[PDB]
Amino acid sequence: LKNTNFWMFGLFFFFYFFIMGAYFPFFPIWLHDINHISKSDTWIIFAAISLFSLLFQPLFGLLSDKLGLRKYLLWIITGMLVMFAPFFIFIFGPLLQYNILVGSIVGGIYLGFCFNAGAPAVEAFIEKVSRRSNFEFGRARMFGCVGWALCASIVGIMFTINNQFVFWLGSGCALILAVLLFFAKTDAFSLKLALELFRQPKLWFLSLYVIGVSCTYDVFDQQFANFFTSFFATGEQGTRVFWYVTTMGELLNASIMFFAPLIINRIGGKNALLLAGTIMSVRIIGSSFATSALEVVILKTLHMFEVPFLLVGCFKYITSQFEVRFSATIYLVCFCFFKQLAMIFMSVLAGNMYESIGFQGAYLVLGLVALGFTLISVFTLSGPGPLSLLR
Amino acid sequence: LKNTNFWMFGLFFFFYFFIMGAYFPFFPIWLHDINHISKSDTWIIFAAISLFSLLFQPLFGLLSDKLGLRKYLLWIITGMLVMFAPFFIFIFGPLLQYNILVGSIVGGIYLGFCFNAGAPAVEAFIEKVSRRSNFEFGRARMFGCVGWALCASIVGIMFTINNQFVFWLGSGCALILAVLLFFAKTDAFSLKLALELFRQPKLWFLSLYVIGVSCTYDVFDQQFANFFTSFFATGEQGTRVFWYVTTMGELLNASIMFFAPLIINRIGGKNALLLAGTIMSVRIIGSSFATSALEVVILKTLHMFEVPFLLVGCFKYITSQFEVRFSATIYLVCFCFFKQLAMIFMSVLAGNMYESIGFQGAYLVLGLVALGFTLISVFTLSGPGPLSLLR
Ligand SMILES: OC[C@H]1O[C@@H](S[C@@H]2O[C@H](CO)[C@H](O)[C@H](O)[C@H]2O)[C@H](O)[C@@H](O)[C@H]1O
Ligand SMILES: OC[C@H]1O[C@@H](S[C@@H]2O[C@H](CO)[C@H](O)[C@H](O)[C@H]2O)[C@H](O)[C@@H](O)[C@H]1O
């Protein structure tokens, strides 16, 4: 598309998710393998990342709307992202081993800021441009997936050689990413209107949909990779093919997000979320009837259909219900602060189901919670209906 | 020259001094004008950087030699330089004003680690390559002067537009540093053996050569720019002229160090330090008898004549006389550390001299101490003398 901002931010995503692609997928490996962390102390790291994300995420909602279309906040995010290289290497890496992990655990608030709490803020910002310009959020964020793809592809291949090469590659993306932010050309509320949203029922109705459907789905994605390798005689060959799927599968997200933002506009965007929660729910429940390798793989791919219909359709439902001047705040509260607060308790009772009643015996329960609240939310979520599509 | 490592480390200097030159000479301007900081609480920053530099430079001397050609410590340096842009922009800048200086002066210890106690670590390291690869240390180091010039030229130009741009551009060079480092192929003792150095008479002689001439010369450049601007019809316009000298003077300084090692090698280096000290000495006295503005411009440039004969001669003297197995240590212990330790002591009475008598009235006492020790060092520093030059 001729619009310049499209081609600017389209690349901003590509890089920001590239630099996150060397962080999120391979973290448990980077722990248990590279830095040698006991799986009984690995949870300690995540205990902080999902804690400092409870203060940063609500707080960014405020700045995202009090600043509006001002780049000011992104400068600090993209700034810290430059420290990405020496973080993992010289700081974060030996700080877990050398002194108390705690010194690194609360020293690992950085990556909460930049990624866990940064990424949602980045998308929340970029949606605002999409309404000021012509293009849709979907084809913009499309690149973020293929950006995310490339990193995971360049890790595994440079892993046997010099795995560190990727981290420096990341901090270089931060600069080229900050370059874009400069060439980007663009162009309020009071806190009393925050408390009013807690009064609004239709705020709670969405938090239900997230807690029930998305928080339950995120705890599910945790030990799915280990579960995946269990359908192979050799635990290695599963770990391999697991990597092969995640790579190609993002080219699908780019393929799905191609026409995704056009499909939602007819369907409404409430019914987009229903459709997401459904795909989530089918995938998870299908893990309970899957016995073979050929079966379990298809399921990992169901995630690639689901994501486009969630995050695109999310903002559609947001802006098509609440004022656009609050579109950023509630996205970093409902789909984050609350999703995080619930994932605390659901990642716990998950572990107490796996080791208790087993994998599939738990994936059934969670699968029912997914579906349960997916279907609850056909009556709960304010907007059109699935029945309105049928008409 | 077909020498591989020469061009690598030659450029390596170019970029590392591009990133220093864009901070060190502009530092006080970056304080008083940009951050709007007073003139009395300037000497809380420089009275902390120096403190931590005193306790790093020793620590750096030993671990520079325990590594030898192992690139380890030089990696930590280049790694932490990647955090350069986030530092001055979003950390060192805003944080200092936010909380008590003390709380944010400790933030300025990083600034010691990478430049004050970092640059000399980069010199010692490459000096050790100067013999394993066939090239002279001086002809590589001249790249630092042109690099130092290029940034500083970019500094003043960009200050009118966006003074931030130089910092970001710096953290870009920290990456290409890592690159050049990877294409460098380069392949013991104990601290008990280091202690013995201090009981060597030969060590005291060079140690005194520093405290006397070198320390007295590095304090001379403190408020010299204040003394320089008075020789103009305008201070503001006389600042622009100082910018031409500081830049072009380095272009000359390269050319001087182009031929330096070729000369220093046959003279011995012992007589090059007496020479360097005489170049310094001639420059100090000139300020006390500065009856014109054209004079003080040449004196500014007389510094550029001195630089090579020192840096080239420090190693060419250390390596010649002292054993190579302590080359980096004694360079960081005798020159950097002791000078710094001694400079903190000379900077006090200096202020109690300017306000006791004046600028031109104080410089005479320094020049006596300067040349005094320059001539004393003729009968202490073991080696040849200016006496052998005539033969
Ligand atoms: O911190 C989690 C964030 O996850 C992303 S979604 C993420 O997108 C990549 C490619 O960009 C892949 O599809 C992953 O499978 C998918 O999880 C959200 O956009 C953020 O809001 C956070 O939820
Ligand atoms: O922190 C001060 C450091 O200064 C350099 S010397 C520096 O070199 C540049 C070009 O590389 C210019 O000539 C400047 O005039 C000159 O001061 C030292 O080599 C380091 O050890 C530090 O002392």
SS (H, E, C) chain B: CCCHHHHHHHHHHHHHHHHHHCCCCCHHHHHHHHCCCCCCCCCCCHHHHHHHHHCCHHHHHHHHHCCCCCCHHHHHHHHHHHHHHHHHHHHHHHHHHHCCHHHHHHHHHHHHHHHHCCHHHHHHHHHHHHHHCCCCHHHHHHHHHHHHHHHHHHHHHHHHHCCCHHHHHHHHHHHHHHHHHHCCCCCCCCHHHHHHHHCCHHHHHHHHHHHHHHHHHHHHCCCHHHHHHCCCCCHHHHHHHHHHHHHHHHHHHHHHHHHHHHHHHHHCCHHHHHHHHHHHHHHHHHHHCCCCHHHHHHHHHHHHHHHHHHHHHHHHHHHHHCCHHHHHHHHHHHHHHHHHHHHHHHHHHHHHHHCCCCCHHHHHHHHHHHHHHHHHCCCCCCCCCHHHHCC
* CA distance to A14, A119, A250, A333, B147, per residue, from A167 (Å): 16, 18, 21, 30, 27
Q: What is the DSSP letter of A100?
A: -
Q: What is the DSSP letter of A90?
A: I
* CA distance to A277, A306, B102, per residue, from B107 (Å): 47, 45, 9
Q: How far apart are the first and last CA of chain B?
A: 34
- Whether A48 and A106 have beta carbons less than 8 Å apart is answered as yes
Task: Give the distance (Å) from ligand 1 centre to CA of residue A372.
Answer: 24
CA atoms within 13 A on the CB side of A27: 16
One-letter amino acid at A249 equals G
Domain A188-391, CATH class in plain words:
mainly alpha
Give the angle subtended at the CA of A119 by the CAs of A116 and A123, to the nearest 5°.
Answer: 150
Query: What resolution (Å)?
Result: 3.5
What is the C-alpha separation between A167 and A173, in angstroms, rounded?
Answer: 10
- Whether A172 and B85 have beta carbons less than 8 Å apart is answered as no
One-letter amino acid at A77 equals I
SS3 call for A222: coil
- Whether A68 and A124 have beta carbons less than 8 Å apart is answered as no
Q: How far is CA A164 from the centre of its chain?
A: 24
Give the angle subtended at the CA of B165 by the CAs of B159 and B167, to the nearest 5°.
Answer: 105
Q: CB-based contacts of B148: which residues, under 8 Å, 6+ apart?
A: B17, B18, B20, B21, B250
Q: How many CB pairs under 8 A join A and B?
A: 39
Task: Give the distance (Å) from ligand 1 centre to CA of residue A148.
Answer: 9
B297-301: long-range contacts at Cβ-Cβ below 8 A with a sequence spacing of 24 or more?
B297/B241, B297/B245, B300/B228, B300/B242, B300/B245, B300/B246, B300/B249, B301/B245, B301/B249, B301/B252
What is the C-alpha separation between B82 and B179, in angstroms, rounded?
Answer: 13
One-letter amino acid at B275 equals L
Q: Which residues of A touch B90 (CB under 8 A)?
A: 75-76, 79-80
**B89 closest CB neighbour out of A79, A86, A168:** A79
Q: Scanning the structure block, which residue is given the tokens 């009837």?
A: A289
Breaks (C-N over 2.5 A) in chain A follow: 187
The CA-based diameter of chain A, rounded to the nearest angstrom, is 64
Q: How far is CA B263 from the centre of its chain?
A: 22
Q: How far is CA B140 from the centre of its chain?
A: 16
Nearest to A34 by CA among A82, A85, A81, A93: A93
Angle between helices B72-80 and B57-65 (to 10 degrees): 140
What is the C-alpha separation between A367 and A284, in angstroms, rounded?
Answer: 5
Nearest to A363 by CA among A302, A307, A273, A281: A281
B284, two tokens: 């100090």
Pocket test for ligand 1, best of A20, A114, A115, A145 (most atoms within 8 A of CB): A145
In this structure, the number of other CB atoms found within 10 A of the CB of residue A236 comes to: 10
What is the C-alpha separation between B353 and A282, in angstroms, rounded?
Answer: 83
In this structure, the number of other CB atoms found within 10 A of the CB of residue A57 comes to: 24
- Whether A317 and A272 have beta carbons less than 8 Å apart is answered as yes
One-letter amino acid at A126 equals I
Residue B223 phi/psi, 5-degree rounding, is: -100, 35
Could you identify the atom of ligand 2 that is nearest to the CA of residue B303? 15
What is the C-alpha separation between B290 and A376, in angstroms, rounded?
Answer: 89
* Burial class of residue B41 in the structure, from the number of CB atoms within 10 Å of its CB (0-12 exposed, 13-18 middle, 19+ buried): exposed
- Whether B22 and B155 have beta carbons less than 8 Å apart is answered as yes
Please give the CATH number for the structural domain made up of B1-187: 1.20.1250.20
Q: How far is CA A217 from the centre of its chain?
A: 11
Strands annotated E in chain A: none
- Whether B169 and B154 have beta carbons less than 8 Å apart is answered as yes
- Whether B171 and B84 have beta carbons less than 8 Å apart is answered as yes
Which residues, judged by CB distance below 6 Å to any ligand atom, belong to the binding site of ligand 2? B 17, 24, 115-116, 119-120, 144-145, 148, 250, 253, 307, 311
A291, two tokens: 């016995």
Continuous H helices in A163-292: 165-183, 192-199, 201-209, 215-220, 224-229, 235-267, 270-286
Name the method of structure determination.
X-ray
**Dihedral through CA A12, CA A14, CA A15, CA A16, nearest 10?**
70
Q: Does B79 touch chain A (CB under 8 A)?
A: yes
B257: left (phi over 0), alpha (psi -120 to 50) or beta: alpha
Nearest to A54 by CA among A345, A346, A336: A336
* CA distance to B12, B61, B65, B349, per residue, from B125 (Å): 12, 10, 9, 35
- Whether B89 and B164 have beta carbons less than 8 Å apart is answered as yes
A306 lines ligand 1 (CB under 6 A): no
- Whether A284 and A220 have beta carbons less than 8 Å apart is answered as yes
A151, two tokens: 């990193």
B304, two tokens: 């550029």
Angle between helices A53-66 and A118-132 (to 10 degrees): 20
Provide the b/e sequence for B211-247 (b: ≥16 CB within 10 Å).
bbbbbbbbbbebebbebbbebbeeeeebeebbeebbb
CA atoms within 13 A on the CB side of B110: 18
What is the C-alpha separation between A145 and B112, in angstroms, rounded?
Answer: 41
Task: Give the distance (Å) from ligand 2 centre to CA of residue B247.
Answer: 13
Q: Which residues of B touch A175 (CB under 8 A)?
A: 85, 168, 171-172, 175
What is the C-alpha separation between A329 and A66, in angstroms, rounded?
Answer: 10
Q: Does A172 touch chain B (CB under 8 A)?
A: yes
Closest approach of A75 to chain B, Cα-based (Å):
9
Q: CB-based contacts of A330: which residues, under 8 Å, 6+ apart?
A: A61, A197, A203, A206, A318, A322
Angle between helices A270-286 and A235-267 (to 10 degrees): 160
Residue A381 phi/psi, 5-degree rounding, is: -65, 120
Nearest to B28 by CA among B223, B169, B203: B223
- Whether B299 and B96 have beta carbons less than 8 Å apart is answered as no
B215, two tokens: 């320390």
Q: Scanning the structure block, which residue is given the tokens 């590509």?
A: A14
Q: What is the DSSP letter of A187?
A: -
Is A90 within 8 Å of B79 when comparing Cβ atoms?
Answer: yes
Could you identify the atom of ligand 1 that is nearest to the CA of residue A304? 13
Nearest to B79 by CA among A104, A126, A87, A236: A87
Based on C-alpha coordinates, what's the Rg of chain A?
20
What is the C-alpha separation between B144 and B14, in angstroms, rounded?
Answer: 4
SS3 call for A248: helix
Based on C-alpha coordinates, what's the Rg of chain B?
21
In this structure, the number of other CB atoms found within 10 A of the CB of residue A82 comes to: 31
Residue A169 phi/psi, 5-degree rounding, is: -60, -35
Q: Scanning the structure block, which residue is given the tokens 């270089």?
A: A172
What is the C-alpha separation between A355 and A363, in angstroms, rounded?
Answer: 13
Nearest to A270 by CA among A303, A308, A309: A309
Breaks (C-N over 2.5 A) in chain B follow: 187
- Whether B153 and B24 have beta carbons less than 8 Å apart is answered as no
Q: Which residues of A touch B80 (CB under 8 A)?
A: 86, 90
Q: Which residues of A touch B76 (CB under 8 A)?
A: 90
Q: What is the DSSP letter of A1?
A: -
Q: Where in chain B is the domain with CATH 1.20.1250.20?
A: 1-187, 188-391
Is B82 within 8 Å of A86 when comparing Cβ atoms?
Answer: yes
Q: Which residues of B touch A172 (CB under 8 A)?
A: 175
What is the C-alpha separation between A144 and B391, in angstroms, rounded?
Answer: 74
Q: Which residues of B touch A79 (CB under 8 A)?
A: 85-86, 89-90
Is B80 within 8 Å of A86 when comparing Cβ atoms?
Answer: yes
What is the C-alpha separation between B156 and B162, in angstroms, rounded?
Answer: 10
**B172 closest CB neighbour out of A79, A89, A175:** A175
Q: Which residues of B touch A95 (CB under 8 A)?
A: none
Closest approach of A367 to chain B, Cα-based (Å):
44
- Whether A112 and A146 have beta carbons less than 8 Å apart is answered as no
B297, two tokens: 């411009």
What is the C-alpha separation between A372 and A360, in angstroms, rounded?
Answer: 18
- Whether B66 and B332 have beta carbons less than 8 Å apart is answered as no
* CA distance to A226, A238, B276, per residue, from A233 (Å): 13, 9, 74
Q: Does B55 touch chain A (CB under 8 A)?
A: no
Nearest to B274 by CA among B358, B214, B359: B214
- Whether the CA torsion A198, A200, A202, A205 is positive or negative: it is positive
**A83 closest CB neighbour out of B86, B168, B175:** B86
Nearest to B353 by CA among B337, B369, B375: B369
**A168 closest CB neighbour out of B89, B172, B175:** B175
Chain A interface disruption, residue of B73, B81, B83, B98, most A CBs within 10 A: B83
Could you identify the atom of ligand 2 that is nearest to the CA of residue B311? 19
What is the C-alpha separation between A111 and A167, in angstroms, rounded?
Answer: 13
Measuring from atom 16 of ligand 2, which residue has the nearest CA? B307
What is the C-alpha separation between A217 and A365, in angstroms, rounded?
Answer: 12
- Whether the CA torsion B120, B187, B266, B248 is positive or negative: it is negative
Could you identify the atom of ligand 1 that is nearest to the CA of residue A307? 13
What is the C-alpha separation between B136 and B150, in angstroms, rounded?
Answer: 23
Nearest to A122 by CA among A260, A317, A318, A328: A328
Q: How far is CA A183 from the centre of its chain?
A: 27
Measuring from atom 22 of ligand 1, which residue has the nearest CA? A120
Q: What is the DSSP letter of A292?
A: S
Is B83 within 8 Å of A79 when comparing Cβ atoms?
Answer: no
B182, two tokens: 């990877």
Q: How far apart are the first and last CA of chain A?
A: 34
B218, two tokens: 């590095």
Residue A72 phi/psi, 5-degree rounding, is: -35, -50
* CA distance to B94, B142, B214, per residue, from B218 (Å): 30, 20, 6
- Whether B65 and B329 have beta carbons less than 8 Å apart is answered as yes
